[PDB]
Design a protein around this ligand. Structure first.
Ligand SMILES: [C-]#N
Length: 153
């Protein structure tokens, strides 16, 4: 359970993301695909992008990044009361896309890295700690849903 103070830190930093969801989305995804190209193989529509330049050029990837961050922000804003939001998400990622929890840890790293790169002054140790806490809660609850749906991790 995160405290109100920790959620305030998470939401405060998230407000910076909201100023440019598309920009942040591109950075986070490109980051993920570069650090872990294996995650790219999971996206049929993006598998062919060879370089970072091509990724930035992709209109579809930019649209996708918006969809991802929009969903994540809606979850974070629930401050832990996200059971209903997690259900559809857990089902498509477990059953349809087969996304191991391990990949969710990789994207969590990508998010933290980008926030650190783009907002040093607002992403100090405490803010990063609060953000890490929130993302861990997300992964914990998503993993539980995985088990219930027959995927596991
Ligand atoms: C999902 N990206």
């Amino acid at each position: 359970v995160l405290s109100e103070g920790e959620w305030q830190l998470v939401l405060h930093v998230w407000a910076k993301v909201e100023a440019d969801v598309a920009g942040h989305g591109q950075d986070i995804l490109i980051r993920l695909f570069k650090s872990h190209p294996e995650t790219l193989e999971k996206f049929d529509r993006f598998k062919h992008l060879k370089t970072e330049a091509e990724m930035k050029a992709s209109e579809d990837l930019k649209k996708h990044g918006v969809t991802v961050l929009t969903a994540l922000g809606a979850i974070l804003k629930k401050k832990g009361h996200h059971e209903a939001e997690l259900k559809p998400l857990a089902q498509s990622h477990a059953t349809k896309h087969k996304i191991p929890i391990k990949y969710l840890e990789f994207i969590s790293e990508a998010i933290i890295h980008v926030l650190h790169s783009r907002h040093p002054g607002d992403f100090g140790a405490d803010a990063q700690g609060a953000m890490n806490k929130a993302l861990e809660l997300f992964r914990k609850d998503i993993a539980a849903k995985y088990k219930e749906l027959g995927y596991q991790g």
